[PDB]
Structures are given as C-alpha cells and as structure tokens.
Amino acid sequence: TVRKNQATLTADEKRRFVAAVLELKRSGRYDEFVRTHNEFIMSDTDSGERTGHRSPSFLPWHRRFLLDFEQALQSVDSSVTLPYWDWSADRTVRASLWAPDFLGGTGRSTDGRVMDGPFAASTGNWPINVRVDSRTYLRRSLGGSVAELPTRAEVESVLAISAYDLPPYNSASEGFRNHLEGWRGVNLHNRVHVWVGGQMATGVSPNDPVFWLHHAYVDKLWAEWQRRHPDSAYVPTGGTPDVVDLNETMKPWNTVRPADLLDHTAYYTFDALEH
Amino acid sequence: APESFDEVYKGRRIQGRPAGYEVFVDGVQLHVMRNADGSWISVVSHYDPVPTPRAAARAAVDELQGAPLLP
Ligand SMILES: [Cl-]
Ligand SMILES: [Cl-]
Ligand code: NA
Numbered sequence: 001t002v003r004k005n006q007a008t009l010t011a012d013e014k015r016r017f018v019a020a021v022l023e024l025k026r027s028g029r030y031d032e033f034v035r036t037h038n039e040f041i042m043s044d045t046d047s048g049e050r051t052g053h054r055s056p057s058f059l060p061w062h063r064r065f066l067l068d069f070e071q072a073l074q075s076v077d078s079s080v081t082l083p084y085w086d087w088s089a090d091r092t093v094r095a096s097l098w099a100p101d102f103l104g105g106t107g108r109s110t111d112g113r114v115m116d117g118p119f120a121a122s123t124g125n126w127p128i129n130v131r132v133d134s135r136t137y138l139r140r141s142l143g144g145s146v147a148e149l150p151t152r153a154e155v156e157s158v159l160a161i162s163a164y165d166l167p168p169y170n171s172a173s174e175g176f177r178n179h180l181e182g183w184r185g186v187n188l189h190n191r192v193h194v195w196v197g198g199q200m201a202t203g204v205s206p207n208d209p210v211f212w213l214h215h216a217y218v219d220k221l222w223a224e225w226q227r228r229h230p231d232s233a234y235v236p237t238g239g240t241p242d243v244v245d246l247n248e249t250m251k252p253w254n255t256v257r258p259a260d261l262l263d264h265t266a267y268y269t270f271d272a273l274e275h
Numbered sequence: 276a277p278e279s280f281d282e283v284y285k286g287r288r289i290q291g292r293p294a295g296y297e298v299f300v301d302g303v304q305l306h307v308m309r310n311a312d313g314s315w316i317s318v319v320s321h322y323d324p325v326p327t328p329r330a331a332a333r334a335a336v337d338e339l340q341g342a343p344l345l346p
Binding site for chain 1: 320323338339345
C-alpha cells in the first residue's frame with residue numbers, strides 16, 4: 001500500500017478517494033475521528049499529560065491515528081490509500097488538491113464557507129456535526145490568516161535537526177519534533193493549519209479532509225528525517241512522567257508504542273522520498 | 276499572572292479571569308490554553324499562539340463571525 005503525492009493522483013484515484021471519505025461521513029465513522037482528535041488536542045497540555053501534541057509522541061501518535069483512518073477508508077474501498085500534501089512545493093490555491101474534483105477551494109469571504117468540491121456544505125454530503133460553534137458548514141481561507149506556507153528551504157532546515165526531541169519535551173523544546181510540529185522555529189505543521197483557515201485552524205481540524213493529506217506529509221517528513229539521521233531516534237527512552245516514552249503505549253489505543261511505529265514500511269510506503 | 280478583563284468587542288462581550296484561566300464570549304466559555312512561554316491559544320484558534328487570553332478572546336470573536344460558541 002503506497003501513499004502517493006496528492007499531485008500525482010489520477011482522476012480515477014481521486015474519484016475513489018473522495019467517494020471513500022463521503023461514505024465514512026455518511027456512515028458516521030468519520031465524525032468519530034474528529035471527536036477523538038479534539039479529545040487529545042484539548043487535553044494535551046505543556047504542564048501536564050500530553051500525547052497527541054506538544055510532545056515527542058506527536059509524530060507516532062498521528063501516525064497510528066492516520067493508520068486508523070486509512071484503514072477505515074480501505075474498508076469502503078480497499079484500493080484507496082492516504083495521499084500527502086507537500087505544501088512546500090504545492091503552495092498556491094491553484095494546486096490540484098484544491099480543485100472542485102478533489103477537496104474544493106477556499107471559502108467565500110462573507111462567511112468563509114466552501115462553495116465547490118465534494119465537501120461543500122451545499123452538497124449535503126458534508127455536514128459539520130462535531131463543532132465548537134453553531135456553524136455547520138466547511139470553512140476555509142487559504143493564505144488568509146498567514147502569509148505563506150513553509151518553503152522547501154525551511155523544511156530542509158528542520159529535517160536538518162539531529163535531535164528528535166529534548167526535555168522539557170513540550171512546546172518549548174528544541175530539536176526536530178517541536179520544530180516540525182511548529183511551536184518553535186520557522187514553524188511548519190502549525191502554520192499549515194493556520195494557512196488553511198476555517199476549521200483546520202481550530203480544535204476540530206479533521207472536519208476538513210485536507211487534515212489527513214497535510215498530516216500524511218508531516219508523517220512523510222519524520223520518515224525523511226529518520227533517513228537523514230539513522231544515528232538519531234525516538235526519546236525519551238523511559239521514565240519520563242506525563243510524556244510518552246519509547247516503549248510505553250499511547251492512548252486511546254493502549255496497545256501501540258512509539259517503538260511499534262518507528263518503521264512505517266510495516267504498514268505502507270511512499271511513492272518517492274528524498275535526496 | 277494574566278490580568279482579567281470584560282469588554283464588548285465587535286458586538287460581543289468578551290471577558291475572562293483566573294480559575295488556570297477562564298475565558299467566555301457572550302456568556303459561553305471559550306476553552307483557552309496557555310503555552311510554556313506564556314503565550315495563549317484557544318479551541319477556536321489552536322495553532323496560532325497570541326500574547327494574552329484577551330488577545331485570544333479577540334481572535335475568537337473575529338473568527339467566529341457572529342457565531343456563538345457551543346457549551
Ligand atoms: Cl524515530
Ligand atoms: Cl518508503
Ligand atoms: Na512516561
């Protein structure tokens with residue numbers, strides 16, 4: 001099972017991807033995911049227990065979380081795989097991904113409501129049930145809140161960091177993870193969420209299908225870093241309170257350890273990598 | 276540490292105070308979160324840290340576009 005660059009997808013592949021996701025929405029399986037992510041993003045704190053974000057397990061956790069989602073898709077169409085969005089290379093709104101036959105474009109100014117694509121509120125196929133405010137439609141504002149998305153140069157700058165993570169193992173940390181995540185440095189992952197706008201910029205970001213393509217790239221980045229730093233690996237290596245150590249099992253599964261997710265190749269591979 | 280407040284912003288009453296800080300927009304609580312460096316974020320803008328819970332409250336009122344928060 002190969003995850004391809006969203007830019008390389010064929011009309012066929014996009015038809016099966018979009019259809020797979022709408023079924024997940026229709027069955028009620030999709031909302032379960034939005035509800036789970038919100039759970040951790042709203043519970044994870046720098047001062048306390050942190051699993052999904054602002055912590056070293058931000059990468060393995062989203063890797064397993066995405067594994068769940070892709071498998072739910074494969075249960076609707078076993079030919080569908082989760083594609084990534086290299087927002088570094090595909091920076092404008094004229095990217096395939098935002099075409100009406102894929103995710104649709106940005107939202108209208110008046111209220112930020114998405115008007116085209118399969119996930120527009122007018123299709124009736126994409127209602128926002130897991131919300132933070134009364135609005136039930138998909139919203140976006142590509143490049144509205146923030147200038148631009150990270151650049152190839154910037155990404156390489158982060159991938160260059162040899163330390164996976166470092167104490168206090170949070171959003172103040174130095175090292176690869178936190179820079180990838182964004183709370184510090186050039187800022188990659190967080191900014192993308194800010195650049196999309198709409199729900200992606202809120203605690204119910206998975207409401208936007210782009211969430212998975214985005215995180216599929218953050219996932220590919222960790223893999224590319226891993227390749228760059230074979231001598232470097234996951235930390236903490238045990239005993240760290242409130243933090244997920246190499247061999248502890250993360251919530252909500254309580255059956256998977258960051259150690260079980262270091263090598264993605266056990267579950268999938270990418271169309272192409274780097275250098 | 277952060278100073279409390281209570282003002283009308285773009286038609287809606289933003290206000291918050293220490294609980295460890297609580298923020299509400301038009302009577303409804305807007306879950307906010309403070310980062311290690313003392314900056315803040317909220318359920319309505321979780322990836323864009325701002326200096327204070329007042330700033331975080333104003334970011335929300337803006338993005339909310341008149342929409343009320345859910346309890
Ligand atoms: Cl690793
Ligand atoms: Cl691979
Ligand atoms: Na631990």
